[PDB]
Design an enzyme around this catalytic site. Structure first.
Site, PDB file in Angstrom:
ATOM      1  N   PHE A  21      15.939  19.688  -0.122  1.00 25.89           N
ATOM      2  CA  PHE A  21      14.242  19.194  -0.632  1.00 25.89           C
ATOM      3  C   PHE A  21      14.055  17.917   0.074  1.00 25.89           C
ATOM      4  O   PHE A  21      13.024  17.788   0.389  1.00 25.89           O
ATOM      5  CB  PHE A  21      14.158  19.279  -2.008  1.00 25.89           C
ATOM      6  CG  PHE A  21      12.949  18.793  -2.581  1.00 25.89           C
ATOM      7  CD1 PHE A  21      12.859  17.618  -3.298  1.00 25.89           C
ATOM      8  CD2 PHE A  21      11.593  19.416  -2.567  1.00 25.89           C
ATOM      9  CE1 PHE A  21      11.592  16.977  -3.904  1.00 25.89           C
ATOM     10  CE2 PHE A  21      10.496  19.057  -2.712  1.00 25.89           C
ATOM     11  CZ  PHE A  21      10.392  17.828  -3.678  1.00 25.89           C
ATOM     12  N   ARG A  74       0.799   8.696  13.145  1.00 23.10           N
ATOM     13  CA  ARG A  74       0.202   9.736  13.773  1.00 23.10           C
ATOM     14  C   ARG A  74      -1.201  10.218  13.764  1.00 23.10           C
ATOM     15  O   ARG A  74      -1.761  10.743  14.658  1.00 23.10           O
ATOM     16  CB  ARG A  74       1.084  10.978  13.289  1.00 23.10           C
ATOM     17  CG  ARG A  74       0.737  12.337  14.097  1.00 23.10           C
ATOM     18  CD  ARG A  74       1.216  13.694  12.898  1.00 23.10           C
ATOM     19  NE  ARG A  74       0.618  13.429  11.606  1.00 23.10           N
ATOM     20  CZ  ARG A  74       0.952  14.184  10.695  1.00 23.10           C
ATOM     21  NH1 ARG A  74       2.069  14.796  10.766  1.00 23.10           N
ATOM     22  NH2 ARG A  74       0.566  13.844   9.525  1.00 23.10           N
ATOM     23  N   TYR A  76       0.769  -1.352   0.066  1.00 22.07           N
ATOM     24  CA  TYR A  76      -0.240  -0.092   0.132  1.00 22.07           C
ATOM     25  C   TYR A  76       0.869   1.283  -0.137  1.00 22.07           C
ATOM     26  O   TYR A  76       0.731   1.873  -0.900  1.00 22.07           O
ATOM     27  CB  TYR A  76      -0.995  -0.030   1.162  1.00 22.07           C
ATOM     28  CG  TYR A  76      -1.820   1.385   1.188  1.00 22.07           C
ATOM     29  CD1 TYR A  76      -2.635   1.677   0.447  1.00 22.07           C
ATOM     30  CD2 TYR A  76      -1.659   2.233   2.193  1.00 22.07           C
ATOM     31  CE1 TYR A  76      -3.492   3.036   0.494  1.00 22.07           C
ATOM     32  CE2 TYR A  76      -2.129   3.425   2.363  1.00 22.07           C
ATOM     33  CZ  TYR A  76      -3.092   3.912   1.554  1.00 22.07           C
ATOM     34  OH  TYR A  76      -3.646   4.901   1.491  1.00 22.07           O
ATOM     35  N   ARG A  83     -11.551   5.554   8.087  1.00 13.11           N
ATOM     36  CA  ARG A  83     -10.516   4.736   7.326  1.00 13.11           C
ATOM     37  C   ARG A  83      -9.553   4.199   8.328  1.00 13.11           C
ATOM     38  O   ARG A  83      -9.489   4.358   9.346  1.00 13.11           O
ATOM     39  CB  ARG A  83      -9.665   5.939   6.729  1.00 13.11           C
ATOM     40  CG  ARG A  83     -10.202   6.905   6.069  1.00 13.11           C
ATOM     41  CD  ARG A  83      -9.376   7.996   5.334  1.00 13.11           C
ATOM     42  NE  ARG A  83      -8.916   9.062   6.056  1.00 13.11           N
ATOM     43  CZ  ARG A  83      -9.771  10.214   6.728  1.00 13.11           C
ATOM     44  NH1 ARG A  83     -10.718  10.285   6.400  1.00 13.11           N
ATOM     45  NH2 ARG A  83      -9.016  10.863   7.703  1.00 13.11           N
TER      46      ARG A  83
HETATM   47  C1  LIG Z   1      12.761  11.296  -2.440  1.00 16.82           C
HETATM   48  O1  LIG Z   1      11.327  11.324  -2.051  1.00 16.82           O
HETATM   49  C2  LIG Z   1      10.804  12.706  -1.704  1.00 16.82           C
HETATM   50  C3  LIG Z   1      11.683  13.803  -1.509  1.00 16.82           C
HETATM   51  C4  LIG Z   1      11.182  14.985  -1.087  1.00 16.82           C
HETATM   52  C5  LIG Z   1       9.867  15.155  -0.574  1.00 16.82           C
HETATM   53  C6  LIG Z   1       9.003  14.087  -0.394  1.00 16.82           C
HETATM   54  C7  LIG Z   1       7.566  14.298  -0.367  1.00 16.82           C
HETATM   55  O2  LIG Z   1       7.605  15.178   0.641  1.00 16.82           O
HETATM   56  C8  LIG Z   1       6.231  15.688   1.114  1.00 16.82           C
HETATM   57  C9  LIG Z   1       6.565  16.490   2.161  1.00 16.82           C
HETATM   58  C10 LIG Z   1       5.170  17.393   2.755  1.00 16.82           C
HETATM   59  O3  LIG Z   1       4.259  17.455   1.747  1.00 16.82           O
HETATM   60  N1  LIG Z   1       4.966  17.827   3.749  1.00 16.82           N
HETATM   61  C11 LIG Z   1       3.573  18.424   4.370  1.00 16.82           C
HETATM   62  C12 LIG Z   1       3.729  17.733   5.572  1.00 16.82           C
HETATM   63  C13 LIG Z   1       2.685  16.486   5.912  1.00 16.82           C
HETATM   64  O4  LIG Z   1       1.758  16.740   4.990  1.00 16.82           O
HETATM   65  O5  LIG Z   1       2.728  15.746   6.777  1.00 16.82           O
HETATM   66  C14 LIG Z   1       3.229  19.791   4.069  1.00 16.82           C
HETATM   67  O6  LIG Z   1       4.240  20.664   4.644  1.00 16.82           O
HETATM   68  O7  LIG Z   1       2.229  19.900   3.593  1.00 16.82           O
HETATM   69  C15 LIG Z   1       5.081  14.378   1.421  1.00 16.82           C
HETATM   70  O8  LIG Z   1       4.622  14.134   2.322  1.00 16.82           O
HETATM   71  N2  LIG Z   1       4.702  13.656   0.097  1.00 16.82           N
HETATM   72  C16 LIG Z   1       3.530  12.940   0.232  1.00 16.82           C
HETATM   73  C17 LIG Z   1       4.146  11.561   0.321  1.00 16.82           C
HETATM   74  C18 LIG Z   1       4.733  10.964   1.453  1.00 16.82           C
HETATM   75  C19 LIG Z   1       2.634  10.599   0.425  1.00 16.82           C
HETATM   76  C20 LIG Z   1       4.744  10.775  -0.973  1.00 16.82           C
HETATM   77  C21 LIG Z   1       5.153  14.343  -1.201  1.00 16.82           C
HETATM   78  C22 LIG Z   1       4.125  14.634  -2.090  1.00 16.82           C
HETATM   79  C23 LIG Z   1       4.831  15.114  -3.465  1.00 16.82           C
HETATM   80  C24 LIG Z   1       5.926  15.452  -3.603  1.00 16.82           C
HETATM   81 CL1  LIG Z   1       6.460  15.885  -4.970  1.00 16.82          CL
HETATM   82  C25 LIG Z   1       6.992  15.028  -2.623  1.00 16.82           C
HETATM   83  C26 LIG Z   1       6.587  14.632  -1.498  1.00 16.82           C
HETATM   84  C27 LIG Z   1       9.651  12.950  -1.174  1.00 16.82           C
HETATM   85  O9  LIG Z   1       8.603  11.794  -1.385  1.00 16.82           O
HETATM   86  C28 LIG Z   1       8.833  10.452  -0.762  1.00 16.82           C
END
Ligand SMILES: COc1cccc([C@H]2O[C@H](CC(=O)N[C@@H](CC(=O)O)C(=O)O)C(=O)N(CC(C)(C)C)c3ccc(Cl)cc32)c1OC
Length: 333
Positions: A253, A183, A136, A193
């Protein structure tokens, strides 16, 4: 730069919050490619999450989503979620997708293809085993780590290994997603969910919702500590992944979401509050994490500090305690 691209960034800052800034800081061709990828994934998630769309419709949509990227007029108006703007104004986003260099288009297209297949598969079922939990997370999160790694390499900012080592890239996504899942127990609960693996929680209670009952709190914390211990196993891959990077902006990043989730796991560990509401980290804590997470030795010192903190909080009566001690020892050497 185009009204089109100006509107993508407006959507980015509307959805992405604190994270938009990190993305706008990326060098060169990377900035636009990640910005568009972020919005496209936002659209896909929104379709997946929308409970008011029937499975019968939802399925072909997830399956065919990679195709809509090439259809100039495709948009979707029938969604009731928070981020519906990206779906409603899709043609603006897909127009800018089609402007990216072809090598970035084909990465994004392939990831969405594979994610949609995967997301459709879990419409039906709950997560049963730990092994299904990983599958998943691969579909909803590990694939985004792989896609981003391939943009970094294809743009020539990072070595080809970053793009090709799919296990390490996958672990970047799985650590973040498992941390959110752990969390967000109560919020997901309330929202109907269920993402904690049955195989784990069923060792404790007859139903996942039982953890919200005050008489179950000892069992709830134990299950929590066990899932937290599961997530910690990805940290060695995380450290390997970050250590290969050479572009400063790409480093910041990738490193920042990862240190925030370390801090989050540490706040959650052995913490009854998870089952009473939303454990978040303080804004001042988060800002400092963002400022300091800019080179490997710093990021490694942060990781080590938070792990030591979890280490000293491990109770001996906890059923996972020596597993927890073990993975923390590994991380530390
Ligand atoms: C090498 O891989 C990565 C490297 C850098 C960042 C991310 C990853 O970081 C955010 C970080 C982010 O989105 N921060 C949020 C905090 C939160 O949502 O908990 C925010 O500040 O809104 C994240 O959460 N996800 C969502 C998924 C993890 C489901 C993929 C995400 C969604 C789209 C993109 Cl392009 C990137 C990410 C990576 O993805 C693994």
């Amino acid at each position: 730069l185009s009204s089109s691209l100006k509107t993508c960034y407006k959507y980015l800052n509307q959805t992405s919050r604190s994270f938009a800034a990190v993305i706008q800081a990326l060098d060169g061709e990377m900035r636009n490619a990640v910005c568009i990828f972020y919005l496209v994934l936002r659209a896909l998630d929104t379709l997946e999450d929308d409970m008011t769309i029937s499975v019968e419709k939802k399925v072909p949509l997830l399956h065919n989503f990679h195709s809509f990227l090439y259809q100039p007029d495709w948009r979707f108006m029938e969604s009731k979620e928070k981020d519906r703007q990206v779906l409603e104004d899709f043609p603006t986003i897909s127009l800018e997708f089609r402007n990216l260099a072809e090598k970035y288009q084909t990465v994004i297209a392939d990831i969405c293809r594979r994610m949609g297949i995967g997301m459709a598969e879990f419409l039906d079922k709950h997560v049963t085993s730990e092994q299904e939990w990983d599958k998943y997370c691969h579909y909803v999160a590990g694939l985004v780590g792989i896609g981003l790694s391939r943009l970094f390499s294809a743009s020539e900012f990072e070595d080809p290994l970053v793009g090709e080592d799919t296990e390490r890239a996958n672990s970047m996504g799985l650590f973040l997603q498992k941390t959110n899942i752990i969390r967000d127990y109560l919020e997901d609960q309330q929202g109907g969910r269920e993402f904690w693996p049955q195989e784990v929680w069923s060792r404790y209670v007859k139903k996942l919702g039982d953890f919200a009952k005050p008489e179950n709190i000892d069992l709830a914390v134990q299950c929590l500590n066990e899932l937290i211990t599961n997530a910690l196993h990805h940290i060695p891959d995380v450290i390997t992944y970050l250590s290969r990077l050479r572009n400063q902006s790409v480093f910041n990043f990738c490193a920042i979401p990862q240190v925030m989730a370390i801090a989050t796991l540490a706040a959650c560990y052995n913490n009854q509050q998870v089952f009473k509401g939303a454990v978040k980290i303080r804004k001042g804590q988060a800002v400092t994490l963002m400022m300091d997470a800019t080179n490997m030795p710093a990021v490694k010192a942060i990781i080590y500090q938070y792990m030591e903190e979890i280490y000293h909080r491990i109770p001996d009566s906890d059923p996972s305690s020596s597993k927890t001690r073990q993975i923390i020892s590994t991380i530390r050497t």
